[PDB]
């Protein structure tokens, strides 16, 4: 359960796993997460920008 | 008695209710109006 | 001088005749939780969340549409008031899908706030959860009718203010769709106001749809243009 | 069960639908039953008249009822989708409804269902590969003192058994509609044995009247 | 005090229940209808209200409010709006068969009762809401109303009085809650059939807004004989509070199932055996007996060895007596399957205003399906008890309470059979 | 210009001072020095709604859909 170098997962044989639901931006105690969301042409809600500062991140 | 006194309703067709409703048109109270002819006048 | 005494939680207050129980509880400052009462529309008794106990009475009455008799004494924090609220809340979250991440009213829902501050903690209802095919009300209003709680507040709003008469309940039992039967684009004035009326994330905004989240955007007072009313 | 219209070009207005002027005279009488100023209350009998003038009702019929009774159409769509007479999908000439809830089921209803099923072939909900035998099961029709019961169009059948099912279906195939009374004795709701209820003739006028 | 008795003929309220006698206005006049009715119309509504409150006519239809107090609620001082009488002739509550028989065989007694009820409160018109599934009997009622108007009997100068009065027949469209007290009133108005809230009672806001009242066909049909026969003679049948004659409809697993008229107070074993054959396989073969119909919890055998058929006695047995549907179920029948099909009935016929009955009937139907298959553990049957507590008493109408009662009666009385079913499925699946 | 954030030259912008009356608000704003615009508190109007008038006879408050 070691914590460090976080990265985004994706579905088994599929697309990105994130939703841009902004739960992680709401809970981030350093306020390091920056999310900007747009839906693509398919209609599923997605992102544009998901930026993390590793400098601010207390892990 | 042992003889069933219906079978008056044996030969009721489809439109008999509305035909009797048409036959009972006259001798009826004059349906009191209330301001407008409809809730949207 | 047209005064009636109501003891809200024991505390006395004078109230004009004809008003509801909920207006008296808001006259003392209480909020009885509610889903289908709205202070600009006609009162219907559909949602049943608004229940409150009157002392020396067997039944639990609906505070949205109850007039005031002489000398009440109203318990807003009694036993069966809380039991009725937790019960109605446990019914409402059954046929309501798991969409709180992808939903658009995720910060500003009412099921979430009232299921925090009034409802139960553990759930039940192992099997079930109906799903309803969504409609297309308009190209300005995104419509996911799976999240609908059938509170019938879009219909009362359309019929009594927009004057259009296009939205209708259809069906019985669990199968009560709320929408247009004839695939017709509900296109009229004040069609945008229906997204603030619908308290759950069913009738949501189309251009706003998946672009924000309401705990981040800060609020600012401002005045309209392009209309003489402002 | 398809509570969205989904144009389906046998529907999809305008489908040609019109009333006989004798039916206009009917609708005049039905609207004159109700008090003036509340003309919107005749939607249910006028829409029933449309159902019996055209065996299943299209969307042009609902629009025409809304035009005659000057109501918005959406209220007519609510009333047509709410009730159970107004079969919006097209049905056949005859329309079998097997009524089963508790006492119908508690007196061996499933044998009647399988007898209909193997005399006709097609299952519930759908229809035969022609018209006139749309089969559905239904909830209580109100004759619970008899068998699981058979409703054909505006006609009951009570106190049945699968051989009488075969008789009724073959005579409907012949076209000669049978008598709508119950079968196998007790022509109405009677104790079928000795008839231990009232036997003496009634007393007529003035039997113990007081301050009339 | 006659010790709870049994009925004897010449005191039945209405004969010709089987169609054996001539049905016409001539036949009704031979049987004894429309006799001295002008002196009933010309005596005053104080007399009719005093007679009905004196006789103690307990109201029928499943509610059980006393009829005299309701008709006295209809004595508002007269405003510029008229008053209506709505005769409710629906049969839901599967087991009923109650006033289908009256409305087919003797409609002239219904016209008796509606004229006396219209005079009783200054009413102006009587809307008779018949079930949509009763088309032949609706045509028979139209023939009766036609002959009533054609003999100059009612209409303008009703029975020679100076009191106009008319009767209209509204066919329904097929529902069960249109049989209620107020969704009936919205079904007349041309809306969809859904109930209203209670703080406007029908004595203040009713059919389009006029103060109306709703009455069952048994109460209406007994209402002329209360006036034309003796004062409080109707309360010489049974106990004192709940008194008179009632139809009893014995369907199900009895030999020759039928309908009878009897006293209100009557023992259940004598009711079942001595008028409708016997229980198939002797008296010991029966498993349970539900009185009332679908809005009443069940009665096991050891309770129904003694308990008579009265409102207060069945409330002391913790079962609210509905209307006359005294049906049985056999030892060799899955009572769980029968009650689960009854819950499927409530799912098919219920509107969806209230979130409690809608969501609760959803859960109770899925849970009763799983208990027919036996696919749970006893914490689920306790949770079924919890939801059947939470539905009852939080709705508009009494269909939610009626969906909560038989589930409660099943959990009260047939607990170990559910335990055995779930044990069988566990031993087979494991 | 490296990530697309919202940089600002504003220390005082992220403040909020929740008070309980207008008088103490004006007193604090005049005490601590800066300018102030005091807006108005606009209560909801006490209406009178009635289900019985939602089901009236001759009036135009006939909902026709419930
Ligand atoms: C679910 C339900 C079913 C009802 N079924 C009937 C019915 O079959 N017949 C009837 O006249 N009233 C029926 N009612 C209405 C009430 O019984 C109503 O009180 C009755 O018409 C008059 O009551 P009373 O005889 O006590 O005056 C029903 C009510 C509900 C809630
Ligand atoms: S926004 Fe954050 S919390 Fe939400 S799905 Fe994406 S990574 Fe997970
Ligand atoms: S409407 Fe409310 S409860 Fe439903 S998914 Fe959206 S946030 Fe969740
Ligand atoms: S769409 Fe929204 S406003 Fe309309 S009934 Fe459903 S939850 Fe209520
Ligand atoms: S309890 Fe159910 S059937 Fe009764 S009014 Fe409410 S939604 Fe309709
Ligand atoms: S607010 Fe009273 S029922 Fe919804
Ligand atoms: S259940 Fe079949 S007739 Fe009542």
Residue numbers in the entry:
A (entry chain S8): 60 to 118
B (entry chain V3): 35 to 75
C (entry chain S1): 6 to 235
D (entry chain V2): 5 to 216
E (entry chain V1): 9 to 438
F (entry chain S4): 68 to 133
Paper text:
The ETC is composed of four large membrane protein complexes: (1) a H+-pumping NADH-coenzyme Q (CoQ; ubiquinone) oxidoreductase (complex [C]I), (2) a succinate-CoQ oxidoreductase (CII), (3) an obligatorily dimeric H+-pumping CoQH2 (reduced CoQ; ubiquinol)-cytochrome c (cyt c) oxidoreductase (CIII2; cytochrome bc1 complex), and (4) a H+-pumping cyt c oxidase (CIV) responsible for O2 reduction. CI is an ∼1 MDa membrane protein complex with 45 protein subunits arranged into two “arms”: a peripheral arm that extends into the mitochondrial matrix and a membrane arm that is embedded in the IMM (Hirst, 2013, Sazanov, 2015). In mammalian heart mitochondria, the majority of CI is found in association with CIII2 and CIV (SC I+III2+IV; respirasome) or in association with CIII2 alone (SC I+III2). Here, we report the isolation of functional SC I+III2 from ovine heart mitochondria.
Because of the hinge-like motions between the different regions of the SC, we carried out focused refinements on distinct sub-regions to generate higher quality density maps. These focused refinements were performed on the peripheral arm of CI, on the membrane arm of CI and on CIII2, resulting in reconstructions at 3.8–3.9 Å resolution and improved atomic models for each region of the SC. CI appeared more stable within the SC than previous preparations of isolated ovine CI (Fiedorczuk et al., 2016), allowing us to improve the model in some peripheral areas that were previously disordered.
